[PDB]
């Protein structure tokens, strides 16, 4: 069970009560020296910051569904250990913590990498989760598409940008439907008509940036082409954002697309953090009461009941020596990020010091007509079962979409066809459309309201943006007005290393508007020796409670200069 697809990454799983993070490295070693040179599983336990390797990379073995890592440490029999129960899954997934004693530490992982046919596997998929400062857990595996992709919103009628979250786009399981042309392995495909291009491919996993912003980056350096990418390496950077009363809630939106450096922002509920728990046969949502049962073993044979005199799980040998492998009272039902896991603890103490536990991994399956538990292995008197059942079967948009034509209600937030700007027939109803203005204003004639950014326009244009290398000075609609730059430029780069500056483009007040984005483009700027004068993009984005806000430089090429500006000036009010 090497599972190549799980190499190269140091996964994370959390135990929410004890307040511990474990770091799993199945193919190698956690790269923490505090943990130790040969840790494949690592206890942190933030609460009293300490470290313990509860699994050595060398001392590894499999057993049916399980992978297990041993260590040469006494406890109490005596040896400390960690194990993962592997189930097949639709995405690469994450490991979820099950339970721990002073010796054993158990997990389960539902993943593509535990399927014995590769048709289900992605050309390339990446970890689609992160943990924040309070080990909360943000995870976008629900967004991952198995076939097809997400049309990214952009006014341009000619070209369309499709993406998948954390993996390549499977174009085969819908033959004929628009995407066929897309080069194999692409997570970001650019259609221009009948021709398709790979503008992005998975490499690293999901990142957490500035507290609460998930960033995912696709790249393509192993490349050619650059017909229209002027010697730029095509790249995609998506920013997932947890909705709020402030932040709209949306489909994904193209905020930049110069130099084949696509920048997408996507307000989606799956960006928010959650780990439920109960000693009952249900949670806060479905009950497991509707679910006597006879699971076959090696030498042995199992018997299980809904919810020892009692015994919820019973082992007998096919030899009528019988042992109980799970009580009734001592129970824990748990929903951990999509995974429903029931445990029993009762346990007749086996030869060794432990009491027999049963861990059941309920999978969702309609065509089960209830469902049946399969035995999937045993480790130090803990018996694992996977249960396909319908009774374990458990992203609300304000605006719809057309053959590329969007719709959005927002100014109607304290059947409808639209009306000329009236705002029940309402301007808010029908198609969204790009409009351009000037004098630091733009009028969305459809919706009936116009935006005016003019109060940002500074009279000596010090807006002060520090990269740890450069000091960008910019201004809105008006020009800059700072030490080295010309009073010409609306944007200006200045290295602190040197002090050497570059005009990033001449200012103008020619606003653009489309689907809640406002855009300033400066086009002068210092010259690749085709001509290539520098330019700046500044996408302004509605945030009801951002106020005026502040610009933020978007990391790209040496050569590309996009800033973002969250501000309530881009909002309808
Ligand atoms: C659900 O159970 C049926 C039983 O025949 C099986 O065919 C199918 O593969 C199962 N699906 C999943 C996703 O477990």
Author numbering: 8 to 83, 88 to 284, 286 to 296, 303 to 309, 316 to 331, 341 to 351, 354 to 403, 407 to 432, ...
Article sentences:
Delivery of these newly synthesized hydrolytic enzymes to lysosomes depends on the P-type lectins, 300-kDa cation-independent mannose 6-phosphate receptor (CI-MPR) and 46-kDa cation-dependent MPR (CD-MPR), that bind the carbohydrate determinant, mannose 6-phosphate (M6P), on lysosomal enzymes. CI-MPR’s extracytoplasmic region contains 15 homologous domains called “mannose 6-phosphate receptor homology” domains (MRH) due to their similar size (~150 residues) and conserved residues, including disulfide bonding. CI-MPR has four non-adjacent CRDs (domains 3, 5, 9, and 15), each with distinctive phosphomonoester and phosphodiester glycan preferences. We now report the crystal structures of the N-terminal five domains of human CI-MPR, revealing the orientation of two CRDs (domains 3 and 5) with respect to each other at pH 5.5 and 7.0.
Crystallization screening of human CI-MPR domains 1–5 protein in the presence of 10-mM M6P resulted in two conditions yielding diffraction quality crystals. Interestingly, both conditions show evidence of the N-glycan at N591 of a crystallographic neighbor partially occupying the carbohydrate-binding site of domain 5. The other CRD (domain 3) remains unoccupied in both structures, unlike bovine CI-MPR domains 1–3, where we showed domain 3 was bound to a ligand: either M6P or the oligosaccharide of a crystallographic neighbor (inset). The interdomain linker between domains 2 and 3 adopts a more extended structure in the absence of ligand, allowing for the repositioning of domain 3. Comparing their bovine domains 4–14 structure at pH 7.4 in the presence of IGF2 with our human domains 1–5 structure at pH 5.5 or 7.0 shows domain 4 rotated ~180°. Another possibility is that PPT1 binding to domain 3 causes a rearrangement of domains such that the binding site of domain 5 is no longer accessible by ligand. This latter possibility of allosteric interactions between the CRDs is consistent with our crystal structures that illustrate that domain interactions can be dramatically altered in the presence or absence of ligands, such as between domain 3 and domains 1 and 2.
